Symmetry: C3
């Protein structure tokens, strides 16, 4: 009789890479790179505030078109590419840092304060910002002007007796001409100094014209300061002051701003990237560099294929007809032929493979408030450094992704081939003296074995001592 | 007779991770992460200067409480969290960069210079800083004031004829009111310009009040400049100048500032982290991100366990009673039973393992003057970038730490199992025709072997040709 | 008869490292680190502009010695260490960022514009810059001075109607004394404001002396601005303005500036580093950190050696006399002795090795406009961060380089040893019942085999069934 061992095969397998062969065919594989976003942003679990025609700093400052964004909270704020301001010409030095400061807070919560003013007009206004069909300037700021042709030195103090750091927004007027500096503040000049016990800032208005924006040559410049609990805010001004009306609370938490043109719909996802959510499963993605939340690592690879199967088609060609397992038996006897899979080695191969997959898939990390990655301006050294570090990070993670897959696939191939050899060796021991290894993965059995002993051999209940004499008479002619 | 091969076992082993199994039990393991500091900082080999109630910049500037820190040197300066200033209100633009500049120098060495002054008071003083029970301002600065109701334009030059870069510290007075600007400098204003052949700086005093600190509304602002050898320092001032009295030497070397609350005691260590020294041995640590000197890499893992043993409990269950080696023999003869370890395979397994440990343990790198990692203020973009790069570095090193251990443990397991198989195969050859492999790691010997031939087999001096006929008559009945 | 298997050997092999043994000897190896530059820079394929005695910013500004650099283009600009300026004392705030801005553009293309000036002298000049044996100042700038003892407020506009971002260079005069501020601009002071619809800048001249450079106490300060298409440039000035004469085009592409003292010759190379080109082949280099173009990664290792051979000198000592392959046969018969290599296993070992080499060698990445890595000044926090990230990048790539080689060499050794064992096992099957394994890698053949059957065994055409009876009579005496 003849008892053969072998393994299954697939008529059409797939291609994976390995550290030693570069291109090999395997029976089964799984992709590790998510290369497709939905095209829509999910509104759960993260809270998303959709800034339609409003940058975050316009909502912060107050703008007639952004009146719908007051005391809002978000985990993620979405800034649209179409946003434009619709108010008095605005200029913020280092606004990029202001934008970060109020992005990470997750909030536009604002509390008005009783700043005691006296001999100034406490309601300066402009036709630039139309609200309610009239002139209204910005909503969180107070443009002070002379009152009765005079502007007394304003020395006001607002102590911080609460447990919050307070963010104050204030600015300076740059009227554009001598004519207006006199008309508006009744002075040839002016100075603004703002201080705390920790730091001080000061500005000087700069008189001269600028290209007209919304028909206005003049501009407002915005500055900010933070008052720690126990400290006080002291404002010392002789003119051109656009006063705060109160403060914003500073918070620290899991929030940021993403710039993106995509609809926000009804879905659930833990990973958000500009052009929609990404399934939070495969360990790598190549959709974007900008992410929020729990996401796959970004790599430059287009694909990574991880074998879950075994090499396709000593042991003879894989059996395309094996369907009940991965490794198994085939036999010929005086009673004909048949096959059966070996479930013990099949299961071992499967669990070792699923173990490896479970260790990688679904394991992602959560990140917030990452540095800016894309730019619309040429800035110089800081920007060069930001680009540099981002590129460095990506090459290293791409490197790790490739090496890991190459090692995992090499392991997988060797992992399944050793199961085949263990099955072979085990069978040989059951038949220690009653069979010969024909060199092709089949054993020649020297007793006239029936189907029942084949079954016994397959389940390791075969007794080599009851066929010992028959086999010796057949093989050595004893 | 029967001769069995096997390996030792441990009644209670430990758990390690591998790249293929995640959780397995082994006989021996070693931790790779130092997760415990001493709680005390060592004063050797590194020289540590303990800044009690003094930040480095107060020692630099001069402060009655910091008089004990003059011309000091350090490899590491320790700044205490309780430090506070005890002098005239002080404000340094970009002090964080000044702090780095004089941190890396390792020194407060100072040399006074003969700046030729004329029609000014060359000893301005303040009640804010009490030294010797009187008014003394700061010790390295010279507050110049009017003399005889006049302040002539001070145009002084101090050439650099030495080989050192010279650091000059100087500042500008901001008196707080018009009243004092006249009283103190006899002028309505003032200007300060400082220049070299390489760069120029200028400031303008800003008059107005500030919250009173130590009962003083006025403040001093500090600026610095570096003069290269061959260049000169030119000071051009009309008032409000707080003049340098000389210069500090700039050096470059292996030094920094650490912020920490911990006692400095008597011990020796090459790795210093805020809360005490760390043994410089295990390749990774999870104590802190802030380190100085030769330290283990920081990882986010709590533990990493490296197998030094073999899988615990074909070859039958490991022998808990084996005590003289790792691999060995067990036998039964007509003369009874016994055991002996195989020292050749035992030693091979041990040396391969110790080789791997020696390659990793004790191999650390020395670092100095690293970027700041912790912050007490919200700064904007530079800070965001500093946090970003630190987090990136850590995830990558944590990744490498996990992968390395997973590979090392998988290797170790396969490494020791192959020794067992080599021993088995070798024994089989000694007994090539006189024995059968019973499939359980034991050989059936077909000659009536005594204890002396067992010893011969164990030491590879067995002659298969002298038992050949006895064995053939027993196994094939020839 | 006796048929032995073995492998070749080398009288003098080389040393490689492996993950398990640290130091082993192999027959063949290949270096992975290029540790030697040419000492000369190639002028192809990259276009190189050699700035002899000119920094890029001098060529940009215009300097009598840099008249040969107008409207030039480059992929790489080389700045020489000997460059010095030869013109009016020059000072550029944040010139390092200006230098980056015009470095990445790859060009000095300049177009003059018709700025409509009126009551000013439109040709201010200085003896500091001698061109054509006369006083000529800088070539791209226009020093405006009073004309007829007056300097009317200059409010000029230059709209951007093209598709290019335009770079304008302009500056402010700091005359050094009151005497000159009156002589030159007929005013006690002056102000300059420059603006667009996106941003604004302003400066105030600072009067006072500075160390004389080229006998001049006065200095020029340079500022720049970028005008986007559709915007306009508005210049508002009352004096001290050094006006632009036109604009430079801003481009974005594969270009940078390298600082290096090396001749540029005639060769071809894709990798440029300060001290000459580097062959673009080995995956790692340790020549420099500063690179341009397609280069090997920088590592701190001095050497990395990758085995291409097999372990040198069960299977007996390698055969130094094997010359026709790597694995082979040796035999003794009644007809004498001989040898032949096995080309099937030899070729398999070779292709697997060349596959691995092809996967690594020649695979490099192309980079442009990297951050500065070397410094000649102490700057504070930005510089500290730049150094920090560069060091981090290098340690991680050095780590990867070492681990990769250690794994590749371990693989290679196991890779070639398994071919030897496969050959052994295959031979045993051809001789399944007609031979014994003597335990030293040789088979004892029990039929009186001639040279012709040895050849048959070597080519797998041996019939074990025709010698079966002879062998059984000899080995079991049947
Ligand atoms: C910050 O606010 C305080 C308090 O209002 C200012 O102090 C006061 O400032 C005014 C205006 O400079 C002073 O009035 C002046 O009086 C002199 C003498 O008669 C006169 O010659 C000036 O033309 C002007 O009228 C006033 O004396 C002064 N003192 C107080 C406490 O009333 C302070 O100056 C402000 N700081 C800034 C930013 O300028
Ligand atoms: C400096 O020069 C600029 C550019 O010429 C001046 O800005 C421009 O001034 C003109 C008036 O001379 C403005 O035209 C006016 O526009 C308004 C609508 O905004 C219209 O109602 C008027 O009938 C008239 O057409 C022009 O818009 C304005 N903007 C630009 C940049 O073109 C600027 O005023 C000058 N500054 C001075 C003289 O100090
Ligand atoms: C830097 O120091 C130099 C040298 O002391 C200054 O030059 C001198 O500055 C003074 C004060 O501005 C000048 O005096 C002035 O004279 C004119 C004419 O009589 C008078 O109208 C002014 O009221 C004042 O008294 C002096 O002429 C001038 N020259 C020298 C060499 O003595 C320089 O101005 C200082 N720079 C700064 C920072 O202002
Ligand atoms: C601008 O307003 C602030 C806040 O009111 C003024 O600062 C404060 O001025 C008062 C006096 O009006 C100070 O009170 C005094 O304190 C000293 C001890 O430091 C004590 O000896 C006196 O008897 C009196 O109680 C107060 O300390 C001071 N500090 C703050 C921030 O509360 C500031 O002077 C005003 N600036 C002007 C008028 O220009
Ligand atoms: C930017 O350029 C514009 C246009 O040239 C300047 O506007 C003009 O500036 C001059 C000089 O300040 C003004 O002349 C002045 O007239 C008054 C009143 O007679 C006189 O008291 C002053 O002494 C001076 O002569 C002129 O009126 C003014 N307006 C125009 C459109 O002609 C603008 O001031 C410049 N901005 C800067 C940077 O100062
Ligand atoms: C402030 O002090 C500095 C240093 O003394 C003055 O700079 C120096 O001024 C002297 C003249 O007092 C210059 O000497 C002259 O040099 C020229 C050649 O450059 C020569 O032709 C003259 O015959 C004379 O020897 C000296 O070069 C100059 N430079 C330095 C830094 O030594 C500066 O002028 C003073 N500023 C004032 C008074 O405002
Ligand atoms: C953003 O602003 C633009 C301009 O105001 C809006 O476009 C207008 O939309 C309204 C209807 O809401 C139309 O009546 C106007 O005619 C449109 N003006 C044009 C042609 O620009 C746009 O809808 C706004 N989008 C939001 C709300 O984010
Ligand atoms: C830091 O400064 C504080 C305040 O001066 C010191 O605390 C004082 O210590 C002295 C003894 O040295 C006592 O007499 C005072 O009563 C303490 N004042 C209080 C209650 O704050 C502190 O010892 C200093 N620590 C050092 C030297 O670093
Ligand atoms: C850079 O500039 C220096 C100084 O002008 C040049 O050195 C001079 O070279 C010329 C010949 O071209 C000699 O006649 C002068 O005597 C040299 N002066 C000295 C001694 O410095 C140098 O050749 C220039 N190198 C270039 C062109 O990059
Ligand atoms: C992998 O095998 C499974 C059956 O176990 C099959 O459903 C799946 O489609 C296969 N995947 C590929 C891509 O071959
Ligand atoms: C990647 O793109 C291919 C082709 O569109 C698609 O079949 C595959 O599902 C994508 N991978 C994922 C899951 O993003
Ligand atoms: C703040 O605004 C609310 C608006 O309803 C008003 O009722 C309240 O009086 C204001 N308080 C202050 C401090 O101005
Ligand atoms: C505000 O300031 C004025 C100053 O005259 C004072 O009379 C008043 O009591 C202060 N308090 C108020 C009403 O806010
Ligand atoms: C300005 O107008 C607002 C309208 O809400 C009012 O509350 C505020 O008191 C006014 N301030 C003054 C006194 O001008
Ligand atoms: C989504 O992501 C980016 C844009 O944010 C871009 O590559 C592309 O539009 C989308 N898909 C791919 C290919 O990543
Ligand atoms: C294995 O199969 C044989 C078939 O003859 C049967 O006799 C024996 O009982 C079976 N043993 C097991 C494990 O069920
Ligand atoms: C490892 O084995 C050694 C004996 O060789 C023993 O002293 C040590 O405690 C063991 N370590 C562990 C943690 O099992
Ligand atoms: C880590 O912590 C555990 C529990 O306190 C301790 O047993 C172990 O020794 C620590 N590891 C080291 C050496 O830091
Ligand atoms: C510097 O200080 C020391 C203090 O002992 C003094 O002797 C010396 O004369 C001073 N020199 C200068 C340059 O002022
Ligand atoms: C210092 O300057 C004065 C200016 O009058 C001069 O007389 C003196 O010689 C100079 N030298 C000294 C004493 O430092
Ligand atoms: C200021 O006092 C110090 C005390 O040591 C003295 O050395 C210095 O010469 C004095 N300067 C002048 C002249 O005011
Ligand atoms: C020591 O290090 C840091 C504080 O610097 C902190 O995590 C903890 O207090 C200490 N131990 C640990 C758990 O790292
Ligand atoms: C090995 O042991 C046997 C025991 O009979 C002894 O005769 C022989 O000399 C020993 N050989 C060695 C290597 O000492
Ligand atoms: C490697 O072997 C080749 C022959 O195949 C030889 O030419 C080369 O010099 C060898 N390299 C080394 C360094 O041994
Ligand atoms: C490295 O240096 C050695 C010694 O000069 C040299 O033999 C070797 O070729 C160099 N490697 C390369 C190719 O740069
Ligand atoms: C620019 O310079 C060239 C030099 O040949 C001159 O012909 C042209 O007229 C100039 N154009 C302007 C706009 O000044
Ligand atoms: C330039 O400006 C003057 C201002 O008087 C004007 O007359 C002339 O037409 C303008 N155009 C030219 C010639 O550039
Ligand atoms: C300045 O001189 C240049 C020489 O090319 C000339 O083109 C320009 O028009 C002159 N400008 C004036 C009017 O001063
Ligand atoms: C070339 O590169 C750098 C200088 O840029 C320096 O290390 C050395 O001069 C050269 N060779 C080496 C050893 O890298
Ligand atoms: C192999 O060699 C033998 C030598 O006897 C020869 O008879 C046989 O034909 C050969 N077979 C092949 C593969 O050429």
């Amino acid at each position: 009789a003849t008892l053969c061992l072998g393994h299954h095969a697939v008529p059409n397998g797939t291609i994976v890479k390995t550290i030693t062969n570069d291109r090999i065919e395997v029976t089964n594989a799984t992709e590790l790179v998510q290369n497709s976003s939905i095209g829509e942003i999910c509104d759960s679990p993260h809270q998303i505030l959709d800034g339609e025609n409003c940058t975050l700093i316009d909502a912060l400052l107050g703008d007639p078109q952004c009146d719908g964004f007051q005391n809002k909270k978000w985990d993620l704020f979405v800034e649209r590419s179409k946003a434009y301001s619709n108010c008095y010409p605005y200029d913020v030095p280092d606004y990029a840092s202001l934008r970060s400061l109020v992005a990470s807070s997750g909030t536009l919560e604002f509390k008005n304060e009783s700043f005691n003013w006296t001999g100034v007009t406490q309601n300066g206004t402009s036709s630039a910002c139309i609200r309610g069909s009239s002139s209204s300037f910005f909503s969180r700021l107070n443009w002070l002007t002379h009152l009765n042709y005079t502007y007394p030195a304003l020395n006001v103090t607002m102590p911080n007796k609460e447990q919050f750091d307070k963010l104050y927004i204030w600015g300076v007027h740059h009227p554009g001409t001598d004519k207006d500096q006199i008309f508006l503040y009744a002075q040839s000049s002016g100075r603004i100094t703002v201080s705390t016990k920790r730091s001080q800032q000061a500005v000087i208005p700069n008189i001269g014209s600028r290209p007209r924006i919304r028909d206005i040559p003049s501009r407002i410049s915005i500055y900010w300061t933070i008052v720690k609990p126990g400290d006080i805010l002291l404002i010392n001004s002789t003119g051109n002051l656009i006063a705060p009306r109160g403060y914003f609370k500073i918070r620290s938490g899991k929030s940021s701003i993403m710039r993106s043109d995509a609809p926000i719909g009804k879905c659930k996802s833990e990973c958000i990237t500009p052009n929609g959510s990404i399934p939070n499963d495969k360990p790598f993605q190549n959709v974007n560099r900008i992410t929020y939340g729990a996401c796959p690592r970004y790599v430059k690879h287009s694909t990574l294929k991880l074998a879950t199967g075994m090499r396709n088609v000593f042991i003879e060609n894989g059996w395309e007809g094996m369907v009940d397992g991965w490794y198994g038996f085939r036999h010929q006897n005086s009673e004909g032929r048949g096959q059966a899979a070996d479930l013990k080695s099949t299961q071992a191969a499967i669990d070792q493979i699923n173990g490896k997959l479970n260790r990688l898939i679904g394991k992602t990390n959560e990140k917030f408030h990452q540095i800016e990655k894309e730019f619309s301006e040429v800035e110089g050294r800081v920007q060069d450094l930001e680009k540099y570090v981002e590129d460095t990070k990506i090459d290293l993670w791409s490197y790790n992704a490739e090496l890991l897959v190459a090692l995992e696939n090499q392991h997988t191939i060797d992992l399944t081939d050793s199961e085949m050899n263990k099955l072979f060796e085990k069978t040989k021991k059951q038949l220690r003296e009653n069979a010969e290894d024909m060199g092709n993965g089949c054993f020649k059995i020297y007793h006239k074995c029936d189907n029942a002993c084949i079954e016994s051999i397959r389940n390791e209940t075969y007794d080599h001592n009851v066929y010992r004499d028959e086999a010796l008479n057949n093989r050595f002619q004893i």
